[PDB]
Structures are given as structure tokens and as C-alpha cells.
Design a protein around this ligand. Structure first.
Ligand SMILES: *[C@@H]1O[C@H](CO)[C@@H](O[C@@H]2O[C@H](CO)[C@@H](O)[C@H](O)[C@H]2NC(C)=O)[C@H](O)[C@H]1NC(C)=O
Ligand SMILES: *[C@@H]1O[C@H](CO)[C@@H](O)[C@H](O)[C@H]1NC(C)=O
Lengths: 50, 48
């Protein structure tokens, strides 16, 4: 996927590996190598008006 | 603000509040704004 990866303060259980949102899309993940809880947010967007 | 004895302080705007709203309006604003959600403007401000 594509998005902005930020450190997440949301704690994970030791067995927890990924966090999912209401829409059943991954929003928080744990890095495979260095075990950190990383937040995933889509890159900024918007409508453009003239 | 004298009006022949009639008292309009409750409906008249109150300069004391930063928002120039009457005391009645403040009660209305607080009671119904429950689901107004965040005014974070959906910028990068709400990281999560
Ligand atoms: C008009 O009504 C307001 C409130 O309905 C009165 O303001 C009250 O004034 C007394 C004494 O100054 C305070 O103890 C109360 O707390 C005030 N009420 C509120 C809601 O702040 C006011 O005195 C009335 N008369 C005039 C001429 O404004
Ligand atoms: C992978 O990351 C570094 C590189 O070797 C090391 O510190 C770590 O032990 C390696 N293995 C695991 C399971 O993270």
C-alpha cells in the first residue's frame, strides 16, 4: 500500500501483529524486523476547485 | 438596555462570551453539538 508511516502510540499485545480499522483495512502495523507499532495513514488528498 | 421594564438580556448577544452569542444560544450550542465530531479540519493535524 501507499501512505504516510508514523510511529503509533496504540499499544499491541505481544502476540498482536497488525491492527485494522472499522472498514477492515490495515491502519496500524508491526514492523517485521524491528518490532515497532507503526501507524498507517493515506497520503493527503482533496478536491481541487478553480 | 432599558426597554420599559422588559428584560431581553437572555436573547440579546452577550459581549462577555468570546463568541458574541446570547445566553440562550450557548445552551443550544452545547446541547446539540454532541455528534459534531472533530473540527481538526482533516489536515495533517489529526495524525491519529
Ligand atoms: C434581566 O435578567 C437577567 C437574567 O435573567 C438579570 O441578571 C441577573 O442579575 C442578578 C443581579 O445582578 C444576578 O445575581 C444574576 O446572576 C443575573 N442572572 C444571570 C443569568 O446572569 C438582570 O438583573 C435582569 N435585569 C436587567 C435590568 O438586566
Ligand atoms: C534482523 O535485524 C538485525 C539485522 O541482523 C538484527 O538486529 C536482528 O536480530 C535480525 N533478526 C531479527 C529476527 O530481527
Amino acid at each position: 500500500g501507499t501512505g504516510v508511516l508514523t510511529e503509533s502510540n496504540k499499544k499491541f499485545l505481544p502476540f498482536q501483529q497488525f491492527g485494522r480499522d472499522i472498514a477492515d483495512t490495515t491502519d496500524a502495523v508491526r514492523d517485521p524486523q524491528t518490532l515497532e507499532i507503526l501507524d498507517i495513514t493515506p497520503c493527503s488528498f482533496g478536491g481541487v476547485s478553480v | 438596555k432599558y426597554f420599559g421594564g422588559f428584560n431581553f438580556s437572555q436573547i440579546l448577544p452577550d459581549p462577555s462570551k468570546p463568541s458574541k452569542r446570547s445566553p440562550i444560544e450557548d445552551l443550544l450550542f452545547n446541547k446539540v453539538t454532541l455528534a459534531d465530531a472533530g473540527f481538526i479540519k482533516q489536515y495533517g493535524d489529526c495524525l491519529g
